[PDB]
Ligand binder design. Structure first.
Ligand SMILES: [Cu+2]
Ligand code: NA
Length: 228
């Protein structure tokens, strides 16, 4: 359980969607981050992978602002202190808005995986994962926007999947957080994206996964193919 309280792009801090405050308001502050009703600091599990809830989290609605970021530069995601128990991958996607992301319909978004990290060291299960590296780095995740990516408005979908109960069907806990960005000084490339409700299925090999047994088979990161 946790959320992203803010991000850093082009060296500028942007406050996130404060999920333990903003839902409890008629007129929450404008943010680059999508609103959600995930007030338990909870998650979407396999029972929701084909629901629109998986796209930007429960009941998500468009953020009203957008952050600029240079192609080839790093975005930092400041998570609220993440439990060491909740081992799992960090995955980050871009979907083009083909206009202002403040008025994109989330169900139309086609996400391209631009970064993913999984199991770092599984010699002693449950081992060391991408979220453990995040924790050690001042509870901050980092993602490079590809220098080749075309300039435009995109929803940036950053996600932890906690696998501590993922041996059970619908046991994995997905924590997606969305942000509106405008990539500047870009290239000409863009991936072929996947609809949010097509990213994951509950029987995927990296979803229904036992972190506590021998990990000599590694960990296949779920979701569609990583953009090169
Ligand atoms: Cu939790
Ligand atoms: Na962890």
């Amino acid at each position: 359980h946790g959320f992203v309280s803010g991000i850093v792009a082009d060296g500028k801090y942007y406050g996130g969607y404060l999920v333990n405050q903003y839902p409890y308001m008629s007129n929450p502050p404008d943010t680059i981050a999508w609103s959600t009703t995930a007030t338990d600091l909870g998650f979407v599990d396999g029972t929701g992978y084909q629901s629109p809830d998986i796209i930007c989290h429960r009941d998500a609605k468009n953020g009203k602002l957008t952050a600029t970021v240079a192609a080839g530069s790093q975005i930092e995601f400041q998570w609220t202190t993440w439990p060491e128990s909740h081992h799992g991958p960090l995955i980050t996607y871009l979907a083009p808005c083909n206009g202002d992301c403040a008025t994109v319909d989330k169900t139309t978004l086609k996400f391209v995986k631009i970064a993913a990290q999984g199991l770092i060291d599984g010699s002693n299960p449950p081992g060391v994962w991408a979220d453990d590296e995040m924790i050690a780095n001042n509870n901050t995740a980092t993602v490079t926007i590809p220098a080749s990516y075309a300039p435009g408005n995109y929803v940036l979908r950053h996600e932890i999947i906690a696998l501590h109960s993922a041996g059970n069907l619908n046991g994995a806990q997905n924590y997606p957080q969305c942000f509106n960005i405008q990539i500047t000084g870009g290239g000409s490339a863009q991936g072929s994206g996947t609809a949010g409700t097509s990213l994951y299925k509950n029987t995927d090999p990296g979803i229904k996964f036992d972190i506590y047994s021998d990990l000599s088979g590694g960990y296949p990161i779920p979701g569609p193919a990583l953009f090169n």
